[PDB]
Write a structure and sequence with these properties.
- This is part of a larger assembly, with chains A, B and C.
- By secondary structure, chain A is mainly alpha-helical.
- Chain A has a two-stranded antiparallel sheet with strand order 1-2.
- Chain B folds into two domains: 91 residues, no CATH class; 100 residues, no CATH class.
- In chain B, 32% of the residues lie in helices and 28% in strands.
- In chain B, helix 1 runs antiparallel to helix 3 and helix 4 packs antiparallel against helix 5.
- The longest helix of chain B has 21 residues.
- Chain B is globular and about 50 Å long.
- Chain C is mostly helical.
- Helices cover 49% and strands 4% of the residues of chain C.
- Chain C has a two-stranded antiparallel ribbon with strand order 1-2.
- In chain C, strand 1 and strand 2 form a beta hairpin.
- The chains are: A mainly alpha, B alpha+beta, C mainly alpha.
- At the B-C interface, helix 1 of B face helix 3 of C.
- Bound molecules: magnesium ion (MG) (35 copies).
- One magnesium ion binds next to loops of chain C.
- Chain C binds one RNA strand through helix 1, strand 1 and helix 3.
- Chain B: Part of the 30S ribosomal subunit. Forms a tight complex with proteins S10 and S14.
- Chain B: This is Small ribosomal subunit protein uS3.
- Chain B: Belongs to the universal ribosomal protein uS3 family.
RNA sequence: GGCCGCAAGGUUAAAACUCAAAUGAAUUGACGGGGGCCCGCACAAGCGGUGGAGCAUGUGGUUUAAUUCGAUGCAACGCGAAGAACCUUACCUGGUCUUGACAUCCACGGAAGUUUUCAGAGAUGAGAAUGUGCCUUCGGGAACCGUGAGACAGGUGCUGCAUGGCUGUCGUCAGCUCGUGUUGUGAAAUGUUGGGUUAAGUCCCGCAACGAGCGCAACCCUUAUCCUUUGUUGCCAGCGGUCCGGCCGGGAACUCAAAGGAGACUGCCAGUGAUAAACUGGAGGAAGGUGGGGAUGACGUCAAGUCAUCAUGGCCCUUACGACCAGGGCUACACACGUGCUACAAUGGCGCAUACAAAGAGAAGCGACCUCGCGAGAGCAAGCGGACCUCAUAAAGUGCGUCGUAGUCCGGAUUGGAGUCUGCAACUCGACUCCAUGAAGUCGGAAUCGCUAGUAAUCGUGGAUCAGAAUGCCACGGUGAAUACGU
């Protein structure tokens, strides 16, 4: 905004892991204000993935997170009718936000029987670079790679 | 834009109500109907008596009406021969026994209703509106009023196009709630149509 | 409104409160379950005899001053315009602008 | 026409005819695809929708005997209307009235009312018994019924471009003026410009200006913390009894109720600043810099809306443009648009069991308990003019089982049969219940809307209007997000 007055709002930790990042993930996955459903879904998926992997929920989630997060994006800038695609860096908080949002949106578009199974399969795939989320990240990286001539 | 009623916004702060009775839902509409008829009647007869406000109160199964006037002698009559007949007619209208009190208005040029009625009468008698408005403002200000505003709108002077003109002196802070403002209006039926008159009078802070 | 409408309302009120008791008794006869269907038939045929204006449902609420048939409020007996007019002058006891 | 020139042309130089102006400089606004400095869900950053389907509702058009009238870029289209079967009703067809459906004046026969009968769709016409009085100088005055004339009554008929009153919008934008003085022949200017600063013509400093008014802010309501008084129908910490029911005896600690106070003021600390105004941060505290929300709309603009709330000038009709009654219409239907509701499913559908609210209404009213009915409901019938009784089990949530991606155990339009209730009367044209049926619809082209926090999204509850008739309007709580680098 024109004023630049806002600050930052406090977020509560997750119920049974003591982590803020999982709480943010649950919030991203919530619809209509039904938080209990979202937290149960994510807990079930994390448990299934930990069983099928063996490491834990925490660092498995983290490992999937480094494989999807971006490092540079583009912004439009109109000049004379067309637009420059200028590349700019991404702050780490925005990196986490974009990673989680891409993960959730990719998982929502699948043909499994339950949302927990969808999310677990997608995030296990993304842990080793096979899903649609990593494809979106690669596309963003490629598009930012092409237009570096305007990167001042 | 439009402005709020100066009387309505100060009823819980400085101005008091004109009706001070209590009733349930079954009596409320009838009480307002009877009050309307009583006020209309007393306005009808007492026109040449310069009455400002009529306060109606209902103690118990009866009624008490207090009229504020600037000519109490003509209202009272001869040793009270008029108050009794007015009381009897009010008792007939309202269906309960009645009692009537008279309150004298000192300095009748500081009451907005009286000034509005005077201006209306002068307009009816074919007097130039600027003349009357200036006299009203001077008369009000000479008696110690803190401010006065007088507005006249309509088909002034018999013109083909209507307009609005107003005069003001002193302070009239309409946005200050605690301030004491007396506001009242009047209508004049000239040979070309209606002319509206509004008066604001500012007296004191608290 | 027109004076004709006010006259019609007055006449309807008169007929209604004149025939109230007879309407009540005939309706009570009809509404009973333990009776004779012949008596019910007679009561039905008798109920139609009365003038239509004796029904309380034939009356419309109207403003006590102007006669407007829309915007009525039962508490005061006036439509919105007249309620606001009177309320702004302090002629309705205890009523004031709300804010919460 | 003359003179000059190779030519292009140069030079000297008229008239008829036509209009009431054409023109210079400066003043106040408005505008610029001119320049600076700011603001706003205005972009950017995100979430959810509309435009496609079915249905509700308003509008345009067409049709009709009539589909009554008005609003009709933003600022009309769930608008007047907070609720059209009869009434409402203002429109159509038919049947009737003429001082009259509604007031005053004069003359005459007069109680007011209560049952009645025939003809008629009703309006109305005629007839049959009955009380025929009440203060009353026995003169009656008259609550109020019928007849006869006119002076008159009546008009939702026209003109919002003749008007009052009331409302929309720019816009909760920070602006708009005046007295005296001074400057200019004058329209006008200064003040109100300049440097900082603020949400603000907010404040400080300088200044041919010195002062003042309407605006901004404060005074008003509600919410968040604590204190004092009173304890019923409200409360139960410490004690006694219990049928486990604050149920009883009891207590005034606590929640709570409603009256009166304290509290938040850049008040204190540090730094910058022009020692100023102010700005960045910290302590204490329930709350920190306008804590949150509402009320409050300057001078004016749009010949904006309203003669159908009402009032009113002028015009118009008076056996009719006024009045009464029955039936119909405002609900039509090749089509086009606005605002909504319900969906297209597994973050779900269905079955069983179990937690946690707020606010509000009630006497031609709300209606428990018990009995009958699968059901809407019916019968009998306590309590309540209410912190006491009724409305009136909150829903999403939680645990267990099933369905396992199918036009389906998704969706509930249309249609047939049988009923309930309100109301003189549910054909046109009401709501609701039961059984049967089971349509389009698999996320919606070009376009387009709202929102910055207890907000969006989603789930329930109450009220006005009202005999009956909400998916609309106005209110109340549960759960509860994403994002804002920047101009
Ligand atoms: Mg009339
Ligand atoms: Mg009705
Ligand atoms: Mg020549
Ligand atoms: Mg040549
Ligand atoms: Mg010129
Ligand atoms: Mg010029
Ligand atoms: Mg400019
Ligand atoms: Mg400009
Ligand atoms: Mg946007
Ligand atoms: Mg649609
Ligand atoms: Mg229409
Ligand atoms: Mg029109
Ligand atoms: Mg609306
Ligand atoms: Mg009708
Ligand atoms: Mg007007
Ligand atoms: Mg001079
Ligand atoms: Mg200015
Ligand atoms: Mg100036
Ligand atoms: Mg200047
Ligand atoms: Mg300045
Ligand atoms: Mg100021
Ligand atoms: Mg203010
Ligand atoms: Mg602190
Ligand atoms: Mg602090
Ligand atoms: Mg116009
Ligand atoms: Mg207008
Ligand atoms: Mg119009
Ligand atoms: Mg009209
Ligand atoms: Mg009819
Ligand atoms: Mg309609
Ligand atoms: Mg189903
Ligand atoms: Mg499917
Ligand atoms: Mg069925
Ligand atoms: Mg905002
Ligand atoms: Mg809510």
């Amino acid at each position: 905004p024109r004023r630049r007055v806002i600050g930052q709002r406090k977020i509560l930790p997750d119920p049974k892991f003591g982590s803020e990042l999982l709480a943010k993930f649950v919030n991203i996955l919530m619809v209509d204000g039904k938080k209990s459903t979202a937290e149960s879904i994510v807990y079930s998926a994390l448990e299934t993935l930990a069983q099928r992997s063996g490491k834990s929920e925490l660092e498995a989630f983290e490992v999937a997170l480094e494989n999807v997060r971006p490092t540079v994006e583009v912004k439009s800038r109109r000049v004379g009718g067309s637009t420059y695609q200028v590349p700019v860096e991404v702050r780490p908080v925005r990196r986490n936000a974009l990673a989680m949002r891409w993960i959730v949106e990719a998982a929502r578009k699948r043909g499994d029987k339950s949302m927990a199974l969808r999310l677990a399969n997608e995030l296990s795939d993304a842990a080793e670079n096979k899903g649609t989320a990593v494809k979106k990240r690669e596309d963003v990286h490629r598009m930012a790679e092409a237009n570096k001539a305007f990167a001042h | 834009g439009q402005k709020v009623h100066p009387n309505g916004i100060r009823l819980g702060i400085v101005k008091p109500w004109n009706s001070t009775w209590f009733a349930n839902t079954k009596e409320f509409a009838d009480n307002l109907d009877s009050d309307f008829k009583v006020r209309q009647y007393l306005t009808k007869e007492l026109a040449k008596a310069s009455v400002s406000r009529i306060v109606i109160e209902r103690p118990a199964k009866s009624i008490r009406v207090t009229i504020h006037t600037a000519r109490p002698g003509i209202v009272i009559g001869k040793k009270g021969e008029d108050v009794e007949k007015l009381r009897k007619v009010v008792a007939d209208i309202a269906g309960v026994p009645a009692q009537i009190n008279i309150a004298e208005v000192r300095k009748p040029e500081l009451d907005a209703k009286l000034v509005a009625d005077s201006i209306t009468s002068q307009l009816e008698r074919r007097v130039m509106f600027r003349r009357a408005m200036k006299r009203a403002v001077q008369n009000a200000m000479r008696l110690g009023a803190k401010g006065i505003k007088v507005e006249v709108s309509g088909r002034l002077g018999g013109a083909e196009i209507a307009r609005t003109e107003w005069y003001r002196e002193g302070r009239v802070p309409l946005h200050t709630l605690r301030a004491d403002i007396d506001y009242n209006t009047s209508e004049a039926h000239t040979t070309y149509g209606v002319i509206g008159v509004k008066v604001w009078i500012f007296k004191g802070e608290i | 409104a027109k004076q004709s409408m006010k006259a019609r309302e007055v006449k309807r009120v008169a007929l209604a409160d004149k025939y109230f008791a007879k309407r009540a008794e005939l309706k009570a006869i009809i509404s009973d379950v333990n009776a004779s269907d012949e008596d019910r038939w007679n009561a039905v045929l008798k109920l139609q005899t009365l003038p239509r204006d004796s029904s309380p449902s034939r009356q419309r609420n109207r403003c006590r001053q102007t006669g407007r048939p829309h915007g009525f409020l039962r508490k005061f007996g006036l439509s919105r315009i007249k309620v606001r007019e009177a309320a702004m002058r302090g002629e309705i006891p205890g009523l004031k602008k709300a804010s919460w």
